[PDB]
């Protein structure tokens, strides 16, 4: 019933992803992860208890790698399932966009932290 | 004759029977000689379970009070003991005792979930378990040889009681794929 | 050593760190799941006795205090807090919370009990905080600002050494201990700190790592005059730092080994001067110095041989 969900998703912005991939809710799990990545890119961060995107240097960013690897395994165990493969390919393309932007932001943070040991 | 003696005794048997378990890595394992619960001890346990079953069958207050007790945790202990090995009569009495606990509606919902997790009945084969590895092997190897079927009957009684309180519902995502199909 | 009964922490994520209590009757564990779990594993029998929740992010390190102060546990987290947990009458409670860091608190270490109830805390803000409990009133805080240029990853206390323990101190004064600790940071430095006149000063800089120092461990005093520190880094190196004379303050680095991957941290054995080294290769290696001063690997422990 949407009230509960909305309220356990900016107070505890993940562990539910786990309640989801346990109660066999693969579809909705991939959805939550995508939503969270979207938040992290500065888009809708207020609906994910996130303070910053490409701003105020780099602080903390928890990446739910184990839940994403379970999603990759579950999408690979369905094989024939065309719908799950279409979702998996969309998710992979989005993860690659994220890792490319993360690499750029990390390289720019490394340049920012190198200015100044000239005080 | 106290609740402390009954549930401590069950716990001791549960601890003793589990330690006699042989590690998979270890090759050739010998128990310090399985203290096969003596026949007298067995008769005593059976009599205790029968008495418990009679009390909980007639008294709803007693049934709820015994199941909610924090130290005895009877449902956990009993289900734990069922995963151990004993001669079929004791198993039958344990099932009867569970049946007596099940005459009360919500306990039933939690019990279905617990039964699915404990894989007393092997729902989904694990590590090529195939035949046996559960009540099916006991039925074919142990009860069929003894030409007596107490365990099968008790199991049917349990299922029958559970179906009455619900054909329950989704009995386990992630594992199988729903359904009361296997049973 | 043959493995015994298999434990179960009933967790939902990777345990980042684990520490046994002083008597080896309890295990504290902490995780990305934001919990600190306490197990009373006495004579086998795995037993969760507490699930301590109070952090808003991953918990990085746990530290047991000396049992003379009762059952006290510290935890530090990505949430920039340090929490002090105490057991009273079998109930675990948060007795203190320190929020004086601007970034993730990566490491916590209790001082030798001779110094009092003192906790060192290293943060990703580059500062180190020393929390002192005097028995009366609130915790006192001495903060070393800009201890490391980028961030502090690890802190370890020096052993309690009485200056001149071979000379009869007149029996009416508490020995004046030289309080020291070592820190490792993201500026590739291992730094030694000393208390002087109630202030903490940088006593030495140790330069040998080419990337972030991940962990630092001061070896316990085995009654030898030589002080030993281990450090490990992102550069895959482990260094053993030795100082033979406490008066010269001269630290010499010896390369222990270079791994092909990151090294987390090295933990000293209390009795045998054995270094445990945990690598990114998912191995734990044990190292011991031979009589010729060479360091040899005495065991390689892989995930999965239990």
Coordinates of C-alpha atoms in Angstrom, one line a residue:
Chain A
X1 CA 0.0 0.0 0.0
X2 CA 2.1 3.0 -1.1
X3 CA 2.2 4.9 2.2
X4 CA 4.6 2.4 3.9
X5 CA 6.8 2.2 1.0
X6 CA 7.2 5.8 0.5
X7 CA 8.1 6.2 4.1
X8 CA 11.0 3.3 4.2
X9 CA 12.9 4.7 1.3
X10 CA 14.5 7.8 2.5
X11 CA 14.9 6.6 6.1
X12 CA 16.5 3.3 5.2
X13 CA 17.2 3.5 1.5
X14 CA 17.9 0.0 0.7
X15 CA 17.4 -2.9 2.9
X16 CA 14.1 -3.8 1.5
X17 CA 15.9 -4.3 -1.8
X18 CA 16.7 -7.2 0.3
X19 CA 13.3 -7.9 1.6
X20 CA 12.4 -7.7 -2.2
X21 CA 14.9 -10.1 -3.7
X22 CA 14.1 -12.5 -1.0
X23 CA 10.4 -12.6 -1.3
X24 CA 10.9 -13.5 -5.1
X25 CA 10.1 -10.0 -6.4
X26 CA 12.8 -9.8 -9.1
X27 CA 10.8 -7.4 -11.3
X28 CA 10.3 -4.8 -8.5
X29 CA 13.8 -5.2 -7.2
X30 CA 15.4 -4.2 -10.5
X31 CA 13.0 -1.2 -10.3
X32 CA 14.1 0.0 -6.9
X33 CA 17.8 -0.2 -7.9
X34 CA 17.2 1.8 -11.1
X35 CA 15.3 4.4 -9.1
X36 CA 18.2 4.7 -6.6
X37 CA 20.8 5.2 -9.3
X38 CA 18.6 7.8 -10.9
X39 CA 18.5 9.6 -7.5
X40 CA 22.3 9.4 -7.2
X41 CA 22.8 11.1 -10.5
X42 CA 21.2 14.3 -9.1
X43 CA 17.7 13.3 -10.4
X44 CA 15.1 13.0 -7.7
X45 CA 17.7 12.7 -4.8
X46 CA 15.1 14.1 -2.4
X47 CA 13.1 10.8 -2.9
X48 CA 16.2 8.8 -1.8
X49 CA 17.7 10.6 1.3
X50 CA 20.7 11.6 -0.8
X51 CA 22.6 15.0 -0.2
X52 CA 24.7 15.3 -3.3
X53 CA 25.3 14.8 -7.0
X54 CA 28.6 16.0 -8.7
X55 CA 28.9 18.7 -5.9
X56 CA 30.7 19.5 -2.6
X57 CA 33.5 17.1 -3.7
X58 CA 33.0 13.4 -3.0
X59 CA 31.7 12.1 0.3
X60 CA 29.9 8.7 0.7
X61 CA 27.9 6.7 -2.0
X62 CA 26.8 3.2 -1.0
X63 CA 26.5 1.0 -4.1
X64 CA 24.3 -2.1 -3.5
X65 CA 26.7 -4.4 -5.5
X66 CA 25.6 -7.7 -3.9
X67 CA 21.9 -7.0 -4.8
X68 CA 22.9 -6.0 -8.4
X69 CA 24.9 -9.3 -8.7
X70 CA 21.9 -11.3 -7.4
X71 CA 19.8 -9.5 -10.1
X72 CA 22.4 -10.4 -12.7
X73 CA 22.3 -14.0 -11.6
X74 CA 18.4 -14.1 -11.5
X75 CA 18.2 -12.5 -15.0
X76 CA 20.8 -15.1 -16.2
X77 CA 18.9 -18.0 -14.7
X78 CA 15.8 -17.2 -16.7
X79 CA 17.5 -17.2 -20.1
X80 CA 14.5 -17.8 -22.5
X81 CA 12.5 -15.1 -20.7
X82 CA 12.6 -12.3 -23.2
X83 CA 11.1 -9.7 -20.9
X84 CA 13.7 -10.4 -18.1
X85 CA 16.5 -10.1 -20.8
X86 CA 15.1 -6.8 -22.1
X87 CA 15.1 -5.4 -18.5
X88 CA 18.6 -6.8 -17.8
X89 CA 20.0 -5.2 -21.0
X90 CA 18.3 -1.8 -20.0
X91 CA 19.8 -2.1 -16.5
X92 CA 23.3 -3.0 -17.8
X93 CA 23.3 0.0 -20.2
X94 CA 22.3 2.3 -17.3
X95 CA 25.0 0.8 -15.0
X96 CA 27.6 1.5 -17.7
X97 CA 26.4 5.1 -18.0
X98 CA 26.7 5.4 -14.2
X99 CA 30.2 3.9 -14.0
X100 CA 31.4 6.2 -16.9
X101 CA 30.1 9.3 -15.0
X102 CA 31.5 7.9 -11.6
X103 CA 34.9 7.5 -13.3
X104 CA 34.8 11.1 -14.6
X105 CA 33.6 12.5 -11.2
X106 CA 36.4 10.5 -9.4
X107 CA 39.0 11.8 -11.8
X108 CA 37.8 15.4 -11.2
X109 CA 37.8 14.9 -7.4
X110 CA 41.4 13.6 -7.7
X111 CA 42.2 16.9 -9.6
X112 CA 40.3 19.0 -6.9
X113 CA 42.1 17.3 -3.9
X114 CA 45.5 18.0 -5.6
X115 CA 44.8 21.8 -5.3
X116 CA 46.2 23.0 -2.7
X117 CA 49.5 21.8 -1.2
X118 CA 50.6 25.4 -2.2
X119 CA 49.6 26.8 1.0
Chain B
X1 CA 7.1 -33.5 36.4
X2 CA 7.6 -29.8 35.5
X3 CA 7.6 -27.7 32.2
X4 CA 11.3 -27.0 33.0
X5 CA 12.1 -30.7 33.1
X6 CA 10.0 -31.5 29.9
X7 CA 11.6 -28.8 27.6
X8 CA 15.1 -29.1 29.2
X9 CA 15.0 -32.8 28.5
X10 CA 13.9 -32.2 24.8
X11 CA 16.6 -29.6 24.4
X12 CA 19.3 -32.0 25.9
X13 CA 18.2 -34.7 23.5
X14 CA 18.2 -32.3 20.7
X15 CA 21.9 -31.2 21.6
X16 CA 23.1 -34.8 22.2
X17 CA 21.6 -36.2 19.0
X18 CA 23.0 -33.3 16.8
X19 CA 26.7 -33.7 18.3
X20 CA 26.6 -37.4 17.2
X21 CA 26.2 -35.9 13.6
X22 CA 29.2 -36.8 11.3
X23 CA 31.0 -33.8 9.6
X24 CA 31.0 -34.1 5.8
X25 CA 34.8 -33.2 5.7
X26 CA 35.5 -36.0 8.3
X27 CA 35.8 -39.5 6.7
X28 CA 34.5 -42.5 8.8
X29 CA 32.8 -40.9 11.9
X30 CA 31.9 -43.0 15.0
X31 CA 29.5 -41.7 17.7
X32 CA 30.6 -42.2 21.4
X33 CA 27.7 -44.9 20.7
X34 CA 24.4 -43.3 20.0
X35 CA 22.5 -43.2 23.2
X36 CA 19.4 -44.4 21.4
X37 CA 16.9 -43.0 23.8
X38 CA 16.3 -45.9 26.0
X39 CA 12.9 -47.7 25.4
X40 CA 11.7 -46.5 28.9
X41 CA 12.8 -43.0 28.1
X42 CA 11.0 -43.2 24.9
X43 CA 7.8 -44.4 26.6
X44 CA 8.2 -41.6 29.0
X45 CA 8.5 -38.9 26.3
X46 CA 5.6 -40.4 24.4
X47 CA 3.4 -40.3 27.5
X48 CA 4.4 -36.7 28.2
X49 CA 3.6 -35.6 24.6
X50 CA 0.3 -37.5 24.8
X51 CA -0.6 -35.7 28.0
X52 CA 0.4 -32.4 26.4
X53 CA -1.7 -33.1 23.4
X54 CA -4.8 -33.9 25.5
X55 CA -4.4 -30.7 27.6
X56 CA -3.9 -28.4 24.6
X57 CA -6.8 -30.2 22.7
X58 CA -9.4 -29.4 25.4
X59 CA -7.9 -26.0 26.7
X60 CA -7.5 -23.1 24.3
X61 CA -5.9 -21.0 27.2
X62 CA -3.4 -23.7 27.9
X63 CA -2.6 -24.1 24.1
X64 CA -1.9 -20.4 23.6
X65 CA 0.0 -20.1 27.0
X66 CA 2.3 -23.0 26.2
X67 CA 3.0 -21.9 22.6
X68 CA 3.9 -18.2 23.6
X69 CA 6.2 -19.2 26.5
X70 CA 9.6 -17.5 25.7
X71 CA 11.9 -20.1 27.4
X72 CA 10.3 -23.4 26.2
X73 CA 9.7 -22.3 22.6
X74 CA 7.8 -25.7 22.1
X75 CA 7.1 -25.3 18.3
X76 CA 10.8 -24.6 17.5
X77 CA 12.0 -27.4 19.7
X78 CA 9.5 -30.0 18.4
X79 CA 10.2 -29.0 14.8
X80 CA 14.0 -29.3 15.6
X81 CA 13.6 -32.7 17.1
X82 CA 11.7 -33.8 13.9
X83 CA 14.9 -33.1 11.9
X84 CA 16.8 -35.6 14.2
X85 CA 16.5 -39.4 13.9
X86 CA 14.4 -41.7 16.2
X87 CA 12.2 -44.9 15.8
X88 CA 8.8 -43.8 13.9
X89 CA 6.6 -44.0 17.0
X90 CA 8.3 -41.0 18.5
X91 CA 7.9 -39.1 15.3
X92 CA 4.2 -40.0 15.2
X93 CA 3.7 -38.6 18.7
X94 CA 5.6 -35.4 17.8
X95 CA 3.2 -34.9 14.8
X96 CA 0.2 -35.5 17.0
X97 CA 1.5 -32.9 19.4
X98 CA 1.9 -30.5 16.5
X99 CA -1.6 -31.3 15.3
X100 CA -2.8 -30.4 18.8
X101 CA -1.0 -27.0 18.6
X102 CA -2.5 -26.4 15.1
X103 CA -6.1 -26.2 16.3
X104 CA -5.7 -22.4 16.4
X105 CA -5.7 -20.2 13.4
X106 CA -2.8 -17.9 13.2
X107 CA -0.2 -20.3 14.5
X108 CA -1.1 -22.2 11.3
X109 CA 0.1 -19.4 9.0
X110 CA 3.5 -19.3 10.7
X111 CA 3.7 -23.1 10.8
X112 CA 3.2 -23.3 6.9
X113 CA 6.1 -20.9 6.4
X114 CA 8.2 -22.8 8.9
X115 CA 7.4 -26.2 7.2
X116 CA 8.5 -24.8 3.8
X117 CA 11.8 -23.6 5.2
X118 CA 12.5 -26.8 7.2
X119 CA 12.0 -28.9 4.0
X120 CA 10.6 -31.7 6.2
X121 CA 9.0 -32.7 3.0
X122 CA 11.6 -32.1 0.3
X123 CA 9.8 -29.4 -1.9
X124 CA 12.7 -28.5 -4.3
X125 CA 15.6 -31.0 -4.8
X126 CA 18.9 -29.6 -3.5
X127 CA 22.4 -30.8 -4.6
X128 CA 20.8 -33.7 -6.6
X129 CA 18.9 -34.9 -3.5
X130 CA 16.5 -36.8 -5.8
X131 CA 14.7 -39.8 -4.0
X132 CA 14.4 -40.0 -0.2
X133 CA 16.1 -37.2 1.8
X134 CA 12.8 -36.7 3.7
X135 CA 9.5 -38.4 4.6
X136 CA 9.4 -40.1 1.2
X137 CA 12.7 -42.1 1.9
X138 CA 11.4 -42.9 5.4
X139 CA 8.2 -44.2 4.0
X140 CA 9.9 -46.4 1.3
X141 CA 12.9 -47.7 3.3
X142 CA 11.9 -47.6 7.0
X143 CA 8.0 -47.9 7.3
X144 CA 7.7 -50.3 4.3
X145 CA 10.3 -52.6 5.9
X146 CA 8.5 -52.4 9.3
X147 CA 5.2 -52.9 7.6
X148 CA 3.8 -50.2 9.9
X149 CA 2.9 -46.7 8.8
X150 CA 2.6 -44.3 11.8
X151 CA 4.7 -41.5 10.3
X152 CA 2.6 -41.4 7.1
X153 CA -0.6 -41.2 8.9
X154 CA 0.6 -38.5 11.2
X155 CA 1.8 -36.5 8.3
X156 CA -1.6 -36.8 6.6
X157 CA -3.3 -35.7 9.8
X158 CA -1.1 -32.7 9.9
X159 CA -1.8 -31.8 6.3
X160 CA -5.5 -32.4 6.8
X161 CA -5.5 -30.0 9.8
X162 CA -3.6 -27.4 8.0
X163 CA -5.8 -27.5 4.9
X164 CA -8.8 -26.9 7.1
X165 CA -7.3 -23.6 8.5
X166 CA -6.5 -22.5 5.0
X167 CA -5.6 -24.2 2.0
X168 CA -2.8 -21.7 2.6
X169 CA -1.4 -19.5 0.1
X170 CA 1.9 -18.6 -1.5
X171 CA 4.1 -21.2 0.2
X172 CA 7.5 -20.0 -0.7
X173 CA 8.9 -17.6 -3.3
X174 CA 12.5 -17.8 -4.3
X175 CA 12.6 -21.5 -3.5
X176 CA 10.1 -23.2 -5.8
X177 CA 7.5 -21.2 -7.5
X178 CA 4.4 -21.0 -5.3
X179 CA 1.7 -23.6 -5.1
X180 CA 0.5 -26.3 -2.8
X181 CA 1.3 -28.5 -5.9
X182 CA 4.1 -30.6 -4.5
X183 CA 2.4 -31.8 -1.4
Chain C
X1 CA 44.1 -27.0 13.9
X2 CA 40.9 -28.9 13.0
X3 CA 37.8 -26.6 12.7
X4 CA 35.0 -26.9 15.4
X5 CA 31.3 -26.1 15.3
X6 CA 30.3 -23.6 12.6
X7 CA 28.9 -20.2 13.9
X8 CA 26.0 -18.2 12.4
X9 CA 25.8 -14.4 12.9
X10 CA 22.3 -14.3 11.2
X11 CA 23.6 -11.3 9.2
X12 CA 22.4 -9.7 5.9
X13 CA 25.8 -8.3 4.6
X14 CA 29.6 -8.5 4.8
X15 CA 31.1 -8.3 8.3
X16 CA 33.7 -5.5 7.8
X17 CA 35.5 -6.3 11.1
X18 CA 35.4 -8.7 14.2
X19 CA 37.0 -8.5 17.6
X20 CA 37.0 -11.0 20.5
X21 CA 36.7 -9.6 24.1
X22 CA 39.6 -9.6 26.6
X23 CA 38.8 -13.2 27.9
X24 CA 37.8 -14.6 24.5
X25 CA 34.3 -15.4 25.7
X26 CA 32.5 -12.8 23.4
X27 CA 32.8 -11.7 19.8
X28 CA 31.8 -8.3 18.6
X29 CA 31.1 -7.9 14.8
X30 CA 30.1 -5.0 12.6
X31 CA 28.7 -4.6 9.1
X32 CA 27.4 -2.5 6.2
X33 CA 23.9 -3.4 7.6
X34 CA 24.6 -0.7 10.3
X35 CA 24.5 -3.2 13.2
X36 CA 27.0 -4.2 15.8
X37 CA 26.3 -7.8 16.9
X38 CA 27.7 -9.4 20.1
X39 CA 28.0 -13.2 20.4
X40 CA 28.7 -15.0 23.6
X41 CA 30.5 -18.1 22.1
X42 CA 31.5 -19.9 25.4
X43 CA 32.6 -23.6 25.1
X44 CA 31.2 -23.8 21.5
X45 CA 27.5 -22.8 21.4
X46 CA 27.1 -19.8 19.0
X47 CA 24.8 -17.3 20.8
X48 CA 23.7 -13.8 19.6
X49 CA 23.3 -11.8 22.9
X50 CA 22.9 -8.3 21.4
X51 CA 21.9 -6.5 18.1
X52 CA 23.2 -2.9 18.7
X53 CA 21.5 -0.4 16.4
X54 CA 22.4 3.3 16.5
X55 CA 24.5 4.1 13.4
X56 CA 23.0 5.6 10.3
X57 CA 25.6 4.1 7.9
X58 CA 28.1 1.1 7.6
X59 CA 30.0 0.3 10.8
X60 CA 33.8 0.1 10.1
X61 CA 35.6 -1.0 13.3
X62 CA 34.8 -2.2 16.8
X63 CA 37.0 -2.1 19.9
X64 CA 36.5 -3.8 23.3
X65 CA 37.7 -1.7 26.3
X66 CA 39.7 -3.4 29.1
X67 CA 37.4 -5.4 31.5
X68 CA 38.5 -3.3 34.5
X69 CA 35.9 -0.7 33.3
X70 CA 33.2 -3.3 32.8
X71 CA 31.9 -4.6 29.5
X72 CA 32.4 -1.6 27.2
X73 CA 32.5 -1.7 23.4
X74 CA 33.3 1.2 21.0
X75 CA 32.0 1.4 17.3
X76 CA 32.8 3.8 14.5
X77 CA 30.9 4.4 11.3
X78 CA 30.4 6.1 7.9
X79 CA 27.7 8.2 9.7
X80 CA 30.6 10.3 11.3
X81 CA 29.7 9.0 14.8
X82 CA 31.6 7.0 17.5
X83 CA 29.2 5.1 19.8
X84 CA 30.2 3.7 23.2
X85 CA 28.1 0.7 24.3
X86 CA 28.1 -0.6 27.9
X87 CA 26.5 -3.7 29.4
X88 CA 24.8 -3.2 32.8
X89 CA 23.1 -6.3 34.3
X90 CA 23.1 -8.1 30.9
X91 CA 21.4 -5.1 29.1
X92 CA 23.4 -3.3 26.4
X93 CA 22.9 0.5 26.2
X94 CA 24.4 3.5 24.3
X95 CA 26.2 5.3 27.1
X96 CA 28.0 7.9 25.0
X97 CA 27.9 9.3 21.4
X98 CA 30.6 11.4 19.8
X99 CA 29.7 13.4 16.7
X100 CA 32.7 15.8 16.5
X101 CA 34.0 14.6 13.0
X102 CA 32.9 16.1 9.7
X103 CA 33.4 12.8 7.7
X104 CA 33.4 8.9 8.1
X105 CA 35.2 7.6 11.3
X106 CA 37.3 4.7 9.9
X107 CA 39.1 3.4 13.0
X108 CA 38.9 3.2 16.8
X109 CA 41.4 1.9 19.3
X110 CA 41.4 1.8 23.1
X111 CA 44.5 2.9 25.0
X112 CA 46.4 0.6 27.4
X113 CA 44.3 0.5 30.6
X114 CA 47.3 2.0 32.6
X115 CA 46.5 5.4 30.9
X116 CA 42.8 5.3 32.0
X117 CA 39.7 4.8 29.8
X118 CA 41.0 6.5 26.6
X119 CA 39.7 6.0 23.0
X120 CA 41.5 7.1 19.8
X121 CA 39.3 7.8 16.7
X122 CA 40.6 8.3 13.1
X123 CA 38.4 10.1 10.5
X124 CA 38.2 10.7 6.8
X125 CA 38.1 14.4 7.7
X126 CA 41.9 14.0 8.3
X127 CA 41.5 14.5 12.1
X128 CA 42.1 12.2 15.1
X129 CA 40.0 12.6 18.3
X130 CA 41.1 11.3 21.7
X131 CA 38.1 10.6 24.0
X132 CA 38.9 10.5 27.8
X133 CA 36.6 9.2 30.6
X134 CA 37.7 10.4 34.1
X135 CA 34.8 8.7 36.0
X136 CA 33.2 12.0 36.9
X137 CA 31.2 14.0 34.3
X138 CA 31.1 14.0 30.4
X139 CA 33.8 12.5 28.2
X140 CA 36.6 15.0 27.5
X141 CA 37.8 15.4 23.9
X142 CA 41.2 16.3 22.5
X143 CA 41.0 16.7 18.7
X144 CA 44.1 16.7 16.5
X145 CA 43.0 18.7 13.4
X146 CA 44.7 18.0 10.1
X147 CA 46.5 14.9 11.4
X148 CA 46.5 13.5 7.8
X149 CA 46.1 15.7 4.7
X150 CA 43.3 13.7 3.0
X151 CA 42.0 11.3 5.7
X152 CA 43.0 9.0 8.6
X153 CA 42.3 5.3 7.9
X154 CA 43.8 3.6 11.0
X155 CA 44.9 4.2 14.6
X156 CA 46.8 1.9 17.0
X157 CA 48.1 2.6 20.5
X158 CA 51.6 2.0 21.6
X159 CA 52.1 -0.6 24.5
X160 CA 52.2 0.8 28.0
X161 CA 56.0 1.2 28.8
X162 CA 57.1 2.7 32.2
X163 CA 60.3 4.8 31.5
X164 CA 63.2 3.3 33.5
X165 CA 61.3 0.2 34.9
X166 CA 64.8 -1.1 36.0
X167 CA 65.1 1.9 38.5
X168 CA 63.1 1.8 41.8
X169 CA 60.5 4.6 41.4
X170 CA 59.7 6.0 44.9
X171 CA 56.5 4.1 45.8
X172 CA 54.2 7.1 46.1
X173 CA 53.8 8.4 42.5
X174 CA 51.8 6.9 39.6
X175 CA 54.4 6.1 36.9
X176 CA 54.4 8.9 34.2
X177 CA 53.8 6.8 31.0
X178 CA 54.9 8.0 27.6
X179 CA 51.5 7.9 25.8
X180 CA 52.0 7.2 22.1
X181 CA 49.9 6.0 19.2
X182 CA 50.5 5.4 15.5
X183 CA 48.1 6.5 12.6
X184 CA 48.0 5.7 8.9
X185 CA 46.4 8.0 6.3
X186 CA 45.4 8.7 2.7
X187 CA 48.6 11.0 2.4
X188 CA 50.7 7.7 2.3
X189 CA 52.2 8.6 5.7
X190 CA 52.4 6.6 8.9
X191 CA 52.6 9.1 11.8
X192 CA 53.6 8.7 15.4
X193 CA 51.9 10.9 18.0
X194 CA 53.0 11.7 21.6
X195 CA 51.2 13.4 24.5
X196 CA 53.3 16.3 25.9
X197 CA 52.0 18.7 28.5
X198 CA 48.4 17.5 27.9
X199 CA 48.6 18.1 24.1
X200 CA 49.1 15.6 21.2
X201 CA 52.1 16.3 18.9
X202 CA 53.4 14.6 15.8
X203 CA 56.6 12.9 17.0
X204 CA 57.6 11.2 13.7
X205 CA 56.6 10.9 10.0
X206 CA 57.3 7.5 8.4
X207 CA 57.6 7.6 4.6
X208 CA 57.7 4.3 2.6
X209 CA 54.2 3.7 1.2
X210 CA 53.4 5.0 -2.3
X211 CA 49.6 4.9 -1.9
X212 CA 47.0 5.1 1.0
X213 CA 47.9 3.5 4.3
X214 CA 45.0 1.1 5.0
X215 CA 46.0 -0.2 8.4
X216 CA 48.6 0.3 11.2
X217 CA 49.3 -2.0 14.1
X218 CA 51.7 -1.3 17.0
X219 CA 53.2 -4.6 18.2
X220 CA 52.5 -5.5 21.9
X221 CA 55.6 -5.2 24.2
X222 CA 57.0 -8.7 24.8
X223 CA 59.5 -7.1 27.3
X224 CA 62.0 -6.3 24.6
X225 CA 63.3 -2.6 24.2
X226 CA 62.6 -2.7 20.4
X227 CA 59.3 -1.1 19.4
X228 CA 57.7 -2.6 16.3
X229 CA 54.9 -1.3 14.0
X230 CA 53.3 -3.0 11.0
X231 CA 51.6 -1.0 8.2
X232 CA 49.8 -2.0 5.1
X233 CA 48.7 0.0 2.0
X234 CA 46.8 0.2 -1.3
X235 CA 50.2 -0.2 -3.0
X236 CA 50.1 -3.9 -1.9
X237 CA 53.2 -3.5 0.4
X238 CA 53.5 -4.4 4.1
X239 CA 56.2 -2.7 6.1
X240 CA 57.6 -3.6 9.5
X241 CA 59.0 -0.5 11.2
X242 CA 61.5 -1.0 14.1
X243 CA 63.0 1.3 16.7
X244 CA 65.7 -0.2 18.9
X245 CA 66.2 2.9 21.1
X246 CA 63.2 4.9 22.4
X247 CA 65.7 7.8 23.0
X248 CA 66.9 8.0 19.3
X249 CA 63.3 7.9 17.9
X250 CA 64.9 6.3 14.8
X251 CA 62.4 4.1 12.8
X252 CA 63.7 1.8 10.1
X253 CA 61.3 0.3 7.5
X254 CA 61.7 -3.3 6.4
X255 CA 59.6 -4.6 3.5
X256 CA 57.8 -7.7 4.7
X257 CA 56.1 -8.5 1.4
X258 CA 54.5 -7.0 -1.8
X259 CA 51.1 -8.6 -2.6
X260 CA 49.6 -8.3 -6.1
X261 CA 46.5 -6.7 -4.6
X262 CA 45.5 -4.2 -1.8
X263 CA 46.3 -5.2 1.8
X264 CA 43.6 -4.2 4.4
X265 CA 45.4 -4.3 7.8
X266 CA 47.9 -6.5 9.8
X267 CA 47.0 -7.7 13.4
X268 CA 49.8 -8.7 15.9
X269 CA 49.6 -11.9 17.9
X270 CA 49.9 -11.1 21.7
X271 CA 52.4 -13.9 22.6
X272 CA 54.4 -14.9 19.4
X273 CA 55.1 -11.6 17.5
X274 CA 53.2 -13.3 14.6
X275 CA 51.7 -10.8 12.1
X276 CA 48.3 -11.7 10.5
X277 CA 48.0 -9.9 7.0
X278 CA 44.6 -9.7 5.2
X279 CA 44.8 -9.1 1.4
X280 CA 42.4 -8.2 -1.5
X281 CA 43.1 -11.7 -2.9
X282 CA 40.7 -13.1 -0.1
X283 CA 43.7 -14.6 1.7
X284 CA 44.9 -14.3 5.3
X285 CA 48.7 -14.9 5.6
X286 CA 50.6 -15.4 8.9
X287 CA 54.1 -14.1 9.2
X288 CA 56.9 -14.7 11.7
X289 CA 60.4 -13.3 12.1
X290 CA 63.1 -16.0 12.0
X291 CA 66.3 -15.9 14.3
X292 CA 68.2 -14.3 11.3
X293 CA 65.7 -11.4 11.3
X294 CA 64.1 -12.7 8.0
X295 CA 60.2 -12.7 7.8
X296 CA 58.7 -16.0 6.7
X297 CA 55.1 -16.8 5.8
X298 CA 54.1 -19.7 8.2
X299 CA 50.5 -20.1 6.9
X300 CA 48.2 -19.2 4.0
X301 CA 44.5 -19.3 5.0
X302 CA 42.1 -19.3 2.0
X303 CA 38.3 -18.6 2.3
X304 CA 36.8 -22.1 2.0
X305 CA 39.2 -24.8 3.6
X306 CA 37.0 -25.2 6.8

